[PDB]
Amino acid sequence: TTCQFLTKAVLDNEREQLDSPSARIVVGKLNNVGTGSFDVLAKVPNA
Amino acid sequence: GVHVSYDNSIRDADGTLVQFMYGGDAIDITKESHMTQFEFCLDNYYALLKKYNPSALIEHLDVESALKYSKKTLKYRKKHSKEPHYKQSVKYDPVLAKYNPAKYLGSVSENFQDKLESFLDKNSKGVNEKKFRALMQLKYMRSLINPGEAVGIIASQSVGEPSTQMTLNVTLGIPRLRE
Amino acid sequence: TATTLNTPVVIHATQLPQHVSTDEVLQFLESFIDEKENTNLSSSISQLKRIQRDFKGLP
Amino acid sequence: CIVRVPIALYVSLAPMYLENPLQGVMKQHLNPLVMKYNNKVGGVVLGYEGLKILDADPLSKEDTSEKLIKITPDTPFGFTWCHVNLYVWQPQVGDVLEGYIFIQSASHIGLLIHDAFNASIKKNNIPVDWTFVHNDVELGHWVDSNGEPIDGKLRFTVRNVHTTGRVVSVDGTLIS
Amino acid sequence: KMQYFLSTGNLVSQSGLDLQQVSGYTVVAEKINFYRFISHFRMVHRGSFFAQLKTTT
Amino acid sequence: MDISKPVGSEITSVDFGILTAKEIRNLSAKQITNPTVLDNLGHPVSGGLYDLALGAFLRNLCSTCGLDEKFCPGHQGHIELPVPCYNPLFFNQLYIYLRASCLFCHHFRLKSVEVHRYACKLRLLQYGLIDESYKLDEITDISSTLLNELKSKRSEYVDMAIAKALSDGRTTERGSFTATVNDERKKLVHEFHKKLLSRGKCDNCGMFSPKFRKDGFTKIFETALNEKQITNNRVKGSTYILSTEVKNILDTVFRKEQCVLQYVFHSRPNLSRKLVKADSFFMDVLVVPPTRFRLPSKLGEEVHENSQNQLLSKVLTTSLLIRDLNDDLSKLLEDRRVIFSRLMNAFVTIQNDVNAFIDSTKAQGVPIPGVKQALEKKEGLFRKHMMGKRVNYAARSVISPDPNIETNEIGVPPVFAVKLTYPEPVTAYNIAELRQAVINGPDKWPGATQIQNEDGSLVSLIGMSVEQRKALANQLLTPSSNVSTHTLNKKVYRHIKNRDVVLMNRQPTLHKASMMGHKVRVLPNEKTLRLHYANTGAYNADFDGDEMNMHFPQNENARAEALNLANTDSQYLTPTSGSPVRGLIQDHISAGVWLTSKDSF
Amino acid sequence: DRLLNSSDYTQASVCRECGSILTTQQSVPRIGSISTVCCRRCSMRFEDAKIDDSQIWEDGQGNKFVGGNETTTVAIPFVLKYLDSELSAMGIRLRYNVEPK
Amino acid sequence: PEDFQQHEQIRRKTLKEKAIPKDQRATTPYMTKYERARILGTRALQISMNAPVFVDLEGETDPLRIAMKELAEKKIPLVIRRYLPDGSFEDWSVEELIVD
Amino acid sequence: MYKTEKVDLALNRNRGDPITQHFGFGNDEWPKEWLEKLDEDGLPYIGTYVEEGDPICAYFDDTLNKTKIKTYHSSEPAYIEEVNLIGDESNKFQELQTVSIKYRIRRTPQIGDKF
DNA sequence: GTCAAGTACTTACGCCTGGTCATTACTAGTACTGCC
DNA sequence: GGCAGTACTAGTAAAGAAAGTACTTGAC
RNA sequence: AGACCAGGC
Ligand SMILES: Nc1nc2c(ncn2[C@@H]2O[C@H](COP(=O)(O)CP(=O)(O)OP(=O)(O)O)[C@@H](O)[C@H]2O)c(=O)[nH]1
Ligand SMILES: [Mg+2]
Ligand SMILES: [Zn+2]
Ligand SMILES: [Zn+2]
Ligand SMILES: [Zn+2]
């Protein structure tokens, strides 16, 4: 029922934070489960 | 959406909480096979000590604090607990939901705590008694589930794939799981 | 040309611009030329010395 | 009319400058920026001064050398915020600019400003009471109300600033 | 209008006949094998109403 | 995807919103008006569904950005509907507010102190204040002196509770929206809408309104107010209503009750302070899609236009019908009757066109699929094209068993060791084995099929000769002739070698160990995959003609996870029970019964 | 790598202040100028808004008007661009607030 | 300028609130199977894009084998930012985390 | 394995508009590379070896003054077993526009074939 | 106000390969021919 | 020699045997 | 791109 959860989402003006894996594939984000549950920070030597 | 967090507390993608700890003990299914098989691991003690390597894995841990509180409650529960569950004024948390089980050596569940010390008292057998219970707890801590495991996929495939082994007066089988 | 390896992605202003004099320009050019040679921007560098020798010399 | 701007930018860093995070920002995003017009700054960038990389952890002091850059998940290039003081040259209307002659054409006085910046004074901005002698041998000189040949410097106002093309140019009028 | 019936299998009739289904009345006789070819002339289908149906009996 | 063309901007959130008719008169490229698509000799007619302002079309440059088919992304456009018409996605929620409101004072038919009680419980639910919203009910013919006093204390109780919790680290001014406050919000609105529709008389001015009727879609009716209760109308001292009439009612309702609908249509607090309007439920202006997304399906010469044009053609036909019907209003008693009865018939049919464009089931009429039905089910857009996609760099072939494979490998044919390829950027260590991989060519294994230059130039290798092919081998590790691309390096699309990583997969992918990651050992003879017997217990595969997929990953974040994380060595124990799935199956077990017997010497 | 990178990967220009995939579009440059990416919704017609020589751009129609140059590239799936096209036809507006502002 | 400065100083201060200090971090000291598969992965993308290599190359040409070699002698300059469900994080370097 | 496709040169027009495309070679500069696979009538030889890219049949078009060749759109190499000439049922006797052709393919039993 | 009888509405395993078929009536028009 | 009848032509217009909850209506 | 038909596991 994709356009019954579409009307209920726009009549709430709902702002979803793109957390579920089904919502991060629609918009192309990296999935939050597993390897994409953190970031990788490269240390650089100079300031 | 549900997955293990870094709190050892599995929860959904938005942040709502489903369990405070995975199965109450936070250990992976694919690693708890030989965990209660003590007489297997006793006979292979010198071979398992080469891969868990105790003295190289004390230095990033705390051995002192969790083993105390695991004896503060086991002394409490074995003296008490002739009475049923509604009578127990508990006075103590279970030792696994107070300290971090993946950092504090000795934070074990209350069946791995009993079945270790029961096996370590039903018989008496060169490896002594103290080098063995300091290796099962090193094995238990390393058998912790990793933070980030897709639990609810594994939990939906652990029901959905054996459900297709029924095909391919109480109600029974696959029409029961629909209800 | 004009990719994310040539240009900043987002660019803004920290604070409102305030004017400088000839001293702040010439103390810059005794340091910005100093900290550059001592790298194919030399077509911009030659146009810097036509401003460094503007306030000091003559074309 | 040189003015100073402190800016905040969001630039990328390449793995070949993972040993020198400072000059990697220089050779990609700052050195291809000098002597070009920039819309978000205001004029032509003369240079930069004092690059400082905003470190990702808020617990390390700004004295420390080992900073750290967030890596994009797809690509191995790191993105970071940085502070630097640009010195930019912005000409604005109403101001008076010294204009040093570069080309004597019969339709325009197309000159240089500070020996780098081109400028334009059209013939219709030049008033009608000035004349221009022809040049048959080989582009001569404009004759003002002084009756003298023009040479070099001129202090004139700003009519328009055209920046859309290759280099900057300053349109100047002669009414004041 | 008959060659359209044989080439498609669809049953275009303004008074829809006394049987349930409306499509799949003609099937390409293969001649991919003689066992395949003789099998088309003995096959009996119940209907396309009954295929799209979640019963067993 | 190119790993050397990075991106720096990330879409962090989305938020749904009504697209009003003012923006799509400004967003647009060109308003399109005639119900014809293309004239004789294939040209797109101007002002039509195919216009050069709406994007490029069939080897003809765009008139908005001036690009061809390869680069013009397509551009938006709108049409002008002369009547406001119902948006069928919002009709059932409109018919709640179409009813439940007095047609005289333009409030809802409840008392305004109880409608205010939902205007302040929902404000507490926008912030993370689920528990304080039940305390708010504990504040307690009747004059307006204490009703104004009751609304004052409730408004001060909410304003004390928000600023307390927002200062006591609990809720940001963006709100705190979780699942169990979405539970109580949906529980409250469905109690709010249930109680609005249960009203006899307006409790602000005590008289009736006639009952409405929803025949279906495309129509709206209000019934006859009876003779017993028009008496209460006289002591204050059946009919097809239009769509301009209903919009004019709800324009007044949302202004007299602006304080309540700001919290019904907002789950997080409205930081933008926009006004919820009655034009939201209507749509005075349709939006035609860009013409890239409705290109005609070419089948040799059998060219049929995409059927969204065929739905929008019927919208434009009625829209230019109904304007000429309004020309006869400018001409003008008998002629008054017949031209207005057909005008009122045309009011229905233009709604029936905008329904049929949006939803093919909300329009009476084999039918043409509307824009709802290109989203819904399997064969939709989410399930068929978002949750699961066709993929590049992948193969599928029948499997044959193979011993003498090291149990963590798959054996690829030469017909798969030539087509499939991997982007390797050249470095100071690759130029031995990747200079030789580019000399061998696209047909010699190990080989290469393309070179991507630094500049994005993609040089093929199929048509080249071997003497020309060695010249590009020496130009490979060269510095940049451009300042802009000095930090890049050439990518050689090499063939798949003995070190690459491969994701094998077999349907139905029931458990997670039916989709593993293997190494490759490239086999020389035939066109079938070679699987070892220990893997077939976990793929559930027999060799009676099973074929199974072969996905070949394209970057080093994905080679490092089918070797370490989706590795087939790490898939020894299935996580259902902890029991293993990998092991020798049929002949290697019956050999051990004879080999470990007492007879074997 | 399966569902995004090697199926329908695209880098599309996105407006920072709109948050809209299929609004911004190419500007038709002058002779000798470079072309820039520019937004339609947060623009304003030049006859309406009475300027600084660089925010002014032009279509291929000839309608020259000032506009918002607040746009940048975001790596999305291409079916997201088709999602907004069949969702703006419904009258729904998706808004894509990117992170670096 | 003045409006962007408030948008920056709110951004850098809330992100300072999310930073758990180095003594008060309470997650596991063992690098997980998921963190290893990306420390090897993201470093392997860097070496192929001409990063400086801190290990002696014994003729290995696969960049992922280089990153697997660099993990053995703790020569990888990457930091894991272990996010928490509240949004807060912990910063663990690779040399601090112990494997397996 | 015997495969058959129908080359039909009259898929475009209707009702007496003239035959714009003829079989055979015309008088443009068409390359001599496809005499090996084609006869003088623009039709292939019986028994030739045809893989992908080789021409199946040649035809001359009048609205372009050019000999376009159709090509073998299949990756599996085949031999040509027979070529039909299909006339039309009409009172006005017409130049041919329809040629049927039959391919044969050696399916020597590779591994992976189901027995 | 509360409880009904009846409606209206949504779901229904995964992947893969081949083939065929595809708008119809009619209506007004330009041209063909029989005719005086 | 030119008029009108038909036969065609290309032209542009209409197309009855599955299960759960939500829902308004409705007697009372 | 569909409608149907024939399959494969
Ligand atoms: N999800 C589905 N799986 C299928 C379907 N048809 C076949 N299969 C798969 O293919 C396999 C078919 O097995 P069979 O029907 O031949 C039963 P059989 O006793 O002949 O197996 P063997 O003993 O291995 O020969 C089985 O493992 C199924 O998982 C289907 O329609 N859906
Ligand atoms: Mg099988
Ligand atoms: Zn365009
Ligand atoms: Zn009223
Ligand atoms: Zn904008």
Author numbering:
A (entry chain A): 1617 to 1663
B (entry chain A): 1029 to 1153, 1160 to 1202, 1214 to 1224
C (entry chain D): 12 to 49, 80 to 100
D (entry chain G): 37 to 174, 214 to 251
E (entry chain B): 460 to 516
F (entry chain A): 1 to 140, 172 to 268, 312 to 406, 413 to 445, 451 to 686
G (entry chain B): 1090 to 1139, 1153 to 1203
H (entry chain F): 55 to 154
From the paper:
RNA polymerase I (Pol I) is a eukaryotic, 14-subunit enzyme that solely transcribes pre-ribosomal (rRNA) from ribosomal DNA (rDNA) repeats. Although all three eukaryotic RNA polymerases (Pol I, Pol II and Pol III) share a structurally conserved 10-subunit core and a 2-subunit stalk, they have evolved distinct structural features, including accessory subunits, and rely each on a unique specialized set of general transcription factors. Since its discovery, Pol I has been shown to exist in two different conformations that differ by the presence of the heterodimer, which can be reversibly dissociated. The form lacking A49-A34.5, termed Pol I*, has reduced transcriptional specificity and activity compared to the complete Pol I enzyme.
In order to better understand the catalytic mechanism of Pol I, we incubated the Pol I EC with the non-hydrolysable nucleotide analog GMPCPP as previously used for Pol II. The Pol I EC was prepared as previously described except that 1 mM MgCl2 was included in the buffer. In the 12-subunit Pol I* EC, lacking the heterodimer, the A12.2C occupies a novel position next to the A135 surface. This new position overlaps with the A34.5-Ct in the complete, 14-subunit Pol I EC, where A12.2C is disordered and only density up to residue 67 is observed. The first area involves part of the A135 External Domain 1 (ED1), which interacts either with the A34.5-Ct (in Pol I) or A12.2C (in Pol I*). The second area corresponds to part of the A135 Hybrid Binding (HB) domain (residues 989 to 1000), which in Pol I interacts with the A34.5-Ct but in Pol I* interacts with the A135 N-terminal tail (A135-Nt), which folds back towards the HB domain. The A135-Nt effectively acts as a switch, changing its positioning to allow or to prevent A34.5-Ct binding to the HB domain. Both A12.2C and A34.5-Ct form similar interactions with the Pol I core, as both interact with two neighboring asparagine residues in the A135 ED1 (N683 and N684) and an aspartate residue (D990) in the A135 HB domain. In the Pol I EC, canonical binding of Spt4/5 (as in the Pol II EC) is precluded by the A49 tWH, as it occupies a position equivalent to the KOW1-L1 domain of Spt5, and by the A49 linker helix spanning the cleft, which clashes with the N-terminal region of Spt5.
